[PDB]
Amino acid sequence: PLPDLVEVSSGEENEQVVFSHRAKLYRYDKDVGQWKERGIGDIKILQNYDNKQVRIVMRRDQVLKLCANHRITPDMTLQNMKGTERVWLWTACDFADGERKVEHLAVRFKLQDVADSFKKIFDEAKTAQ
Amino acid sequence: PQVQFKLVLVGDGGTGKTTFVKRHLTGEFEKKYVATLGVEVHPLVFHTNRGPIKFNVWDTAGQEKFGGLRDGYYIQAQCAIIMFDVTSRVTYKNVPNWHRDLVRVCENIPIVLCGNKVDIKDRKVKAKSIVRKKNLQYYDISAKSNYNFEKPFLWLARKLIGDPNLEFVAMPALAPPEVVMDPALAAQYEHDLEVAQTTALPDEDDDL
Ligand SMILES: Nc1nc2c(ncn2[C@@H]2O[C@H](COP(=O)(O)OP(=O)(O)NP(=O)(O)O)[C@@H](O)[C@H]2O)c(=O)[nH]1
Ligand SMILES: [Mg+2]
């Protein structure tokens, strides 16, 4: 026996989507010294209406599970990967796995104006908090 | 009490059973073949419109010398996945043996047959030569391109629960805490990120 239906609450009902586009997310593994693919889907920058606080959220296609859920603070910045383009690196305290994990993340975009748009909105939103 | 199901994963070596499970677990794509020894049990949770369901995946070894006690790992199994490599006909020729070994122990459990590596263009096993049991189901998949990589669990979930309209739903994203660190520890992670920035991304020269 199973509940005939279960209403899903995304947890984003009191937030505004200020950025949303398809991307690829990577996570660095200190143990083996390699970047590992983490997810593929729409990476979203969310800002809460009331307290104006900002977070990044990302779910994976098809399985729809989280691969990113962490706050953005005014101190945080996006770095470029010297040899790669349309890619942004940053460090975050992520809770996608229901636990605090400090993670070095990279996001890859297909188009440059999407990457530039992601850097723009990232820097605006973090200061607007 | 949560709803669980024992799922046994069988197939020849290098077919992509462990790569498939790791993909579901962490979203990574393991490029190396590190042969599984005996069995490894990994829980997979999916959020459905009828609540979360957990799959306890028993990832079994495909090489006979590393098999351990395979037929014993099938005991009390509630579903199964058989995998092969569509670029290798031998891995498909052994599918009836894996199916035989499974049914000998678990009788009428729902089973999904997965033809993996369809991202590779030199395909030797065509889906027309597979396609018909009620408890059988076939999917082309690719652990590398993620093509159909959710369908085996979605179909098994629908059968086990008895609801053809069961859907996977978005995972709840609860508000994350803001973590504040002393400028010292922030610098230690800023240095670590610099070190990581020197290593390239794994798919840098893939199709993308
Ligand atoms: N091109 C391609 N390679 C894949 C795909 N899935 C897995 N592989 C690769 O094929 C190999 C599969 O390895 P692995 O999953 O460890 O094998 P296994 O099925 O667990 N075998 P065993 O039963 O011996 O443990 C790895 O080299 C992996 O990178 C796919 O969809 N496409
Ligand atoms: Mg394996």
XYZ file of N, CA and C and ligand atoms in Angstrom, chain B residues 10-20 29-37 59-63 66 83 85 116-120 141-146, ligand 1:
149
model
N 22.629 -7.680 -13.190
C 23.472 -8.734 -13.734
C 23.874 -8.367 -15.156
N 24.925 -9.010 -15.631
C 25.398 -8.787 -16.984
C 26.880 -9.070 -17.094
N 27.340 -9.139 -18.338
C 28.738 -9.430 -18.604
C 29.635 -8.268 -18.172
N 30.932 -8.560 -18.102
C 31.893 -7.533 -17.744
C 31.960 -6.430 -18.782
N 32.222 -5.215 -18.305
C 32.326 -4.064 -19.176
C 31.044 -3.627 -19.844
N 29.899 -4.208 -19.479
C 28.648 -3.800 -20.108
C 28.189 -2.435 -19.614
N 28.602 -2.036 -18.422
C 28.256 -0.753 -17.869
C 27.301 -0.787 -16.692
N 27.238 -1.897 -15.955
C 26.359 -1.984 -14.794
C 26.785 -1.004 -13.707
N 28.057 -1.050 -13.311
C 28.538 -0.147 -12.270
C 28.552 1.300 -12.748
N 29.005 1.547 -13.982
C 28.945 2.900 -14.528
C 27.524 3.446 -14.460
N 26.542 2.610 -14.808
C 25.139 3.015 -14.773
C 24.714 3.408 -13.365
N 30.387 10.092 -14.650
C 30.555 9.081 -15.692
C 31.939 8.452 -15.539
N 31.981 7.241 -14.999
C 33.238 6.527 -14.830
C 33.700 6.004 -16.185
N 34.876 6.446 -16.619
C 35.444 6.003 -17.881
C 36.210 4.698 -17.751
N 36.746 4.411 -16.569
C 37.524 3.201 -16.363
C 36.621 2.001 -16.117
N 37.101 0.831 -16.523
C 36.494 -0.442 -16.149
C 37.245 -0.968 -14.930
N 36.589 -0.938 -13.772
C 37.117 -1.512 -12.538
C 36.169 -2.645 -12.164
N 36.564 -3.875 -12.486
C 35.659 -5.011 -12.385
C 35.104 -5.140 -10.973
N 33.795 -5.363 -10.883
C 33.152 -5.561 -9.594
C 33.503 -6.929 -9.028
N 33.775 -6.964 -7.729
C 34.111 -8.188 -7.017
C 32.920 -8.580 -6.156
N 24.613 -4.767 -7.200
C 25.449 -4.733 -8.398
C 26.378 -5.941 -8.370
N 26.065 -6.957 -9.172
C 26.800 -8.213 -9.153
C 27.942 -8.207 -10.170
N 28.892 -9.117 -9.958
C 30.055 -9.232 -10.828
C 29.734 -10.064 -12.060
N 30.282 -9.647 -13.199
C 29.966 -10.270 -14.466
C 30.983 -11.297 -14.904
N 32.209 -11.180 -14.399
C 33.237 -12.180 -14.660
C 33.070 -13.342 -13.685
N 35.213 -13.548 -10.499
C 34.871 -12.586 -9.460
C 33.435 -12.747 -8.977
N 21.860 -6.241 -18.288
C 22.488 -5.285 -19.184
C 23.453 -5.976 -20.137
N 26.024 -4.825 -23.956
C 26.673 -3.790 -24.753
C 26.290 -4.005 -26.211
N 23.080 -1.197 -23.644
C 23.851 -0.021 -23.278
C 24.860 0.348 -24.365
N 25.319 1.604 -24.304
C 26.355 2.147 -25.177
C 25.808 2.475 -26.563
N 24.509 2.767 -26.658
C 23.935 3.178 -27.930
C 24.521 4.491 -28.433
N 25.268 5.207 -27.592
C 25.996 6.375 -28.062
C 27.123 6.004 -29.018
N 27.592 4.761 -28.980
C 28.627 4.298 -29.900
C 27.971 3.954 -31.229
N 19.676 2.236 -23.773
C 20.176 3.221 -22.821
C 21.610 3.590 -23.183
N 22.079 4.681 -22.578
C 23.480 5.081 -22.670
C 23.859 5.754 -21.359
N 24.684 5.080 -20.558
C 25.186 5.702 -19.341
C 25.997 6.955 -19.643
N 26.547 7.071 -20.852
C 27.388 8.215 -21.185
C 26.554 9.419 -21.610
N 25.570 9.208 -22.484
C 24.675 10.274 -22.918
C 23.424 10.376 -22.054
N 23.242 9.462 -21.100
C 22.096 9.411 -20.196
C 20.803 9.065 -20.917
N 30.788 4.686 -24.667
C 30.200 4.228 -23.543
N 30.946 3.645 -22.604
C 30.221 3.235 -21.539
C 28.869 3.350 -21.335
N 28.511 2.801 -20.110
C 29.642 2.371 -19.608
N 30.714 2.608 -20.424
C 32.109 2.260 -20.194
O 32.195 0.848 -20.287
C 32.875 0.298 -19.126
C 31.856 -0.336 -18.214
O 32.511 -0.625 -16.958
P 31.714 -1.142 -15.670
O 30.390 -0.450 -15.554
O 32.704 -1.037 -14.566
O 31.417 -2.680 -16.033
P 30.340 -3.647 -15.362
O 29.148 -3.659 -16.260
O 30.163 -3.117 -13.968
N 31.124 -5.079 -15.312
P 31.427 -6.106 -14.067
O 30.242 -7.037 -13.919
O 32.761 -6.744 -14.381
O 31.674 -5.330 -12.793
C 33.663 1.486 -18.567
O 34.896 1.617 -19.246
C 32.695 2.649 -18.843
O 33.357 3.880 -18.991
C 28.071 3.973 -22.325
O 26.844 4.161 -22.298
N 28.841 4.386 -23.416
